[PDB]
Write a structure and sequence with these properties.
Keywords (chain B): Calcium, Lectin, Manganese, Metal-binding, Pyrrolidone carboxylic acid
PDB class: sugar binding protein
Family (chain B): Belongs to the leguminous lectin family.
Number of helices of chain A: 0
Oligomer: homodimer
Largest interface: A-B, 25 and 24 residues
Shape of chain A: globular
Bound molecules: a molecule of 2 linked components (MAN-NAG)
GO molecular function, one term (chain B): carbohydrate binding
CATH topology of chain A: Jelly Rolls
Protein name (chain B): Lectin
């Protein structure tokens, strides 16, 4: 399809179109990307990702078209620790993408110690950002944090995020906000054609090594349409 | 998702989200449900079906919600003969739906000879035992589970001509409306009240099916756009 969209106001346990990878699973009508015990507490050494089953036609060579797509989602991170790690990421990658071997910890289950475009929200502190505070980073292929912005982790607080891509400017924009209005934005130019195949899959990934926290994907809506 | 949308203005050969069944495949930027030869011509004894890969959340009991959905598509039937058969159909069925063994010919690859589903079939074949339509002429029929053509409207077969069809379901009225029109404006419409909750599981797959027995014709799906959204009710 030239255009595709879907919306998950919530994530009930009877999912049919989510490709669950690693420890990702539904709990409390939300996607717990990372493992939680029988009490819902985040645990160490965990990775998890989800992918919408329908592939997205990000761009088409034959027609010289690229997709204009938007990805809105909310998540929250909770941890008994004052330093929960490592982060959650929205990503776009080849359809057969799987969690790379040894991609835990700060690798968010996205990078091996490819092709992808990711917007990651890292909490646990490598210089492309200020190691002191957490950060939002955009990743293109094997280049993590090609562009970033200081971010504030807020345990238990939801962060609504809007990731948009305009093919006429090739501007990948990211706007994240908390319920009180606190905003964070980072954008970067990226020709999706030069880093991703025509057909791709979108989803989220998250991980925790020794430091942990839940990576709860509360909602998610997506839309893509090929434009000349 | 409570909402799913997708549109195919055309069907280029590099598809990913379509589940091809039977002889269904892509040729000349369109879906040929029934087999065609090297010359694009139809051949007898063939059945083909396509389903969108993602399942649609048609209705949900826990929230007492039913999906409002619309399905727009275009097809054209072409045959060197004059008794082109048997027909094409848009249908909704359980996710694991597959061609019922022996569902060829007038069974459109949808029903078994001698389910749960809603379908809107566009028939061009003749049935001597027709009870819901005039057998002497083709017909657009709405199917609900085991009842084929619970409602129908006379229709005309125009070789090679595209029929633009819009199938919509309003959970509030439970009206399943079908409006078909050829490029010259010739319009056909048939609607039937149906509570999808009583005939289909919460999750389903949408798609098309077609077949040809001794008589044949092409069942070319040229475009298709679909939308579905859950709401209280
Ligand atoms: C337990 C685990 O999965 N460790 C992976 C590791 O986690 C490390 C480190 O990467 C993280 O920065 C922090 C934050 O908590 O946790 C641990 O210290 O990354 C390795 C590669 O970099 C993986 O091979 C490990 O599996
Ligand atoms: C030849 C063939 O495929 N027959 C299938 C059968 O076909 C019939 C009938 O359905 C058609 O209306 C006409 C015109 O195409 O041809 C034959 O008379 O349906 C059977 C199951 O109902 C299949 O098993 C046959 O393969």
């Amino acid at each position: 399809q030239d255009s595709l969209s879907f919306g998950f106001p919530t994530f009930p346990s009877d999912q049919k179109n989510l490709i669950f990878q690693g420890d990702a699973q539904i709990k409390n009508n939300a996607v717990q990307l990372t493992k939680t015990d029988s009490n819902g507490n985040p645990v160490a050494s965990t990775v998890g990702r989800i992918l919408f089953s329908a592939q997205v036609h990000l761009w088409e060579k034959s027609s010289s078209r690229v997709a204009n797509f938007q990805s809105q989602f909310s998540f929250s991170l909770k941890s008994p620790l004052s330093n929960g790690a490592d982060g959650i990421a929205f990503f776009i990658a080849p359809p057969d993408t799987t969690i790379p071997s040894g991609s835990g910890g700060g690798l968010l289950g996205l990078f091996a110690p490819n092709q992808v475009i990711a917007v990651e929200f890292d909490t646990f502190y490598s210089n492309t950002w200020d190691p002191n505070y957490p950060h939002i980073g955009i990743d293109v292929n094997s280049i993590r944090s090609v562009k970033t912005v200081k971010w504030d982790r807020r345990d238990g607080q939801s962060l609504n995020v809007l990731v948009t891509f305009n093919p006429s400017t090739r501007n990948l924009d990211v706007v994240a906000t908390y319920s009180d209005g606190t905003r964070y934005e980072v954008s970067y130019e990226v020709d999706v054609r030069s880093v991703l195949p025509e057909w791709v899959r979108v989803g989220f990934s998250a991980a925790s090594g020794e430091q942990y926290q839940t990576h709860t994907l509360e909602s998610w809506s997506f839309t893509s349409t090929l434009l000349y």
